[PDB]
Structures are given as C-alpha cells and as structure tokens.
Amino acid sequence: AFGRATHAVVRALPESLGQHALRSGEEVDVARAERQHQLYVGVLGSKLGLQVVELPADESLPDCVFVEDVAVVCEETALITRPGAPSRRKEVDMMKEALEKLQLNIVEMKDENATLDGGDVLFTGREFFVGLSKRTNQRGAEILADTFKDYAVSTVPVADGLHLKSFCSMAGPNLIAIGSSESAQKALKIMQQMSDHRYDKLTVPDDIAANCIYLNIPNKGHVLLHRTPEEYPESAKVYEKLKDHMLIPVSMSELEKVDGLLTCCSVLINKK
Ligand SMILES: *c1ccnc(CSC[C@H](N)C(=O)O)c1
C-alpha cells in the first residue's frame, strides 16, 4: 500500500565524481562522499531490512552513483531510462543486468529522441508526475506512460537546471514534502490541478531537504530518511514534528554539490 519495498539497488561512486561529475563552487571531498554513501547504504541494508544490490563503480562514468536516473521501478515493471546527458547513458548497462537478475519486467527507453531522468519522475502511488527540463523531454514522458498503463502521467515544467525531485519528494501516502522557494511552490500548484484527488503537504523551508525517502516497513512503522539538522536545521524542525514516523537523519552534503540527493542514490524495489 505504497512505500513497501524489499530490495534497493545502489552503485559505488568513483574517483571521477570529484572532478568530472556534472553539476550546476567548492570542490568535492571524494572520501567524505563515499563515507556518507556507505552509511546511506547501511541504512537501507543493515538497518531497514532491505538487501542492497551494490553495483561496482565505473571510472568512465562519474555520475554512476545516482542510479535513480537510469531506472524507474513500479510493482513488477522497471523502465530503463534514456538519460538527458549523453555521457550518462552508459550507466544503464549494469543497471539492466542487475534488475534482470531480480527478474523484473524490463522496458528500455531506446527512442533516439527520448530523454528522461529518474529524478524528474515523482510517483505518488496513484499517478506519476514528470518534470519537463533539459534532462527529461515531452516524448520522454510519453514512454513512461506507455510503460505504466494503469497510471495517469502529468508533466510539470522544471526551470533552471533542476530536476522535479530537487525540491519535492514523497514523505508518505498522499503526503508530498515540498520546498518553500518560488519554483517549488509553482510546480506544486500545477501538479494539483491535473490530479482529481487532493494531496497533502509537508512544507519545509529548504528545497534540498524537501527530498526525503519514505519507506513502509511492516510492524516497524513509517520510516523517513531526511536531511540532518546540521545540514538543514530549519527543515529538520519540520520532520521532527512527525512523532508517528521513524525519523532517520541522513547526511548527503558532499553529493549535494553535484545536485545529488537522497532519492537519487538508490532504486527501491518491492518484489512480491
Ligand atoms: C536527484 C535529484 C535531482 N537531480 C539529480 C540528478 S544529479 C546527477 C548528475 N549530477 C546530473 O545529471 O546532474 C538526482
């Protein structure tokens, strides 16, 4: 019933990430990013009971750590994306291998005109929302709908160099964690006109902290992976009011420099 998952698929980050990972100041501490990453990996694996499929790092692919961009998974059908950046399209080769070893329904985005980034796809359990930016185009959302037939797909424009989940994420069933800046409050109002259902809102002052990770572990509660108070204290105050969720402060300050967030580093899978 939304949020249930049994497997997580991640990928180690390479040394190429420090100097050659795409971004939109301050250099990246490669050692710290991989310390924050394994702790991130430890929470999905040894903490929340999921088994984490760790994928080896490819030094020719600086952004290989952000596996969400190359796969959108729903129920028993996984969509292999064609990323917006041509240099990221080879990240999908090992992604397809691993997801196959899990025996999912594999739909590859092969249209030479299709580009879709997994960070631009916000799935609410009832329908999809696809950000329209330079990474995800119109037709790129049209294979997403063609892939997942039983869900409505509505597209929302994303300005600047952002993804859709750069300022928003699901913090619960029918609950949408939203940022407070002007671009997020604009994309949120647009999405609620297309949906015939009324969604809830968890407004946080920091757009980066609006990207969380919601999980539903049976008899364990509703788990929320949010940004630590050291990273964003004003936004961690909001998540602290949720006394009925298992709150876990996860740090991602290094990978945030290359526009990498909590959601983008793992592909969550329910296999039953
Ligand atoms: C998660 C949330 C928002 N944006 C992303 C893409 S970052 C990966 C790479 N640096 C890039 O293509 O910008 C992931």
Tokens for 67, please give them: 């596996």
Q: What is the position in ligand 1's atom list of the atom closest to the CA of 88?
A: 12
Alpha-carbon distance of 259 to 74, in angstroms, equals: 24
Specify whether the CB–CB gap between 207 and 256 falls below 8 A: no
> Does the Cβ of 22 fall within 6 Å of ligand 1?
yes
Q: Could you tell me if 13 and 50 are in contact, meaning their C-beta atoms sit under 8 angstroms apart?
A: no
Mutate to test the pocket of ligand 1, among 11, 13, 69, 166 (most ligand atoms within 8 A of CB): 69
C-beta 166 within 6 A of ligand 1: yes
Domain ranges of the chain: 1-272
Per the CB < 8 A criterion, the answer to whether 119 and 132 are in contact is: no
Three-state secondary structure call for residue 269: strand
Instruction: Count Cα neighbours of 52 within 13 Å in the Cβ-side half-sphere.
Output: 22
Q: Resolution in A, one decimal?
A: 2.4
Ligand 1 atom nearest to 161, measured from its CA: 13
Half-sphere exposure of 3 (CA within 13 A, CB side): 24
DSSP calls for 202-268? EE-S-TTTT--EEEEETTTEEEEEEE-TTT-HHHHHHHHH-TTEEEEEE--TTGGGGT--SGGG-EE
SS3 15: coil
Among 168, 264, 268, name the best residue to mutate to test ligand 1's pocket (greatest count of ligand atoms within 8 A of Cβ): 264
SS3 30: helix
CA-to-CA distance for 213 and 171, rounded, in angstroms? 7
Q: How far apart are CA 242 and CA 267, in angstroms?
A: 25
- Cβ(167) – ligand 1 distance below 6 Å: no
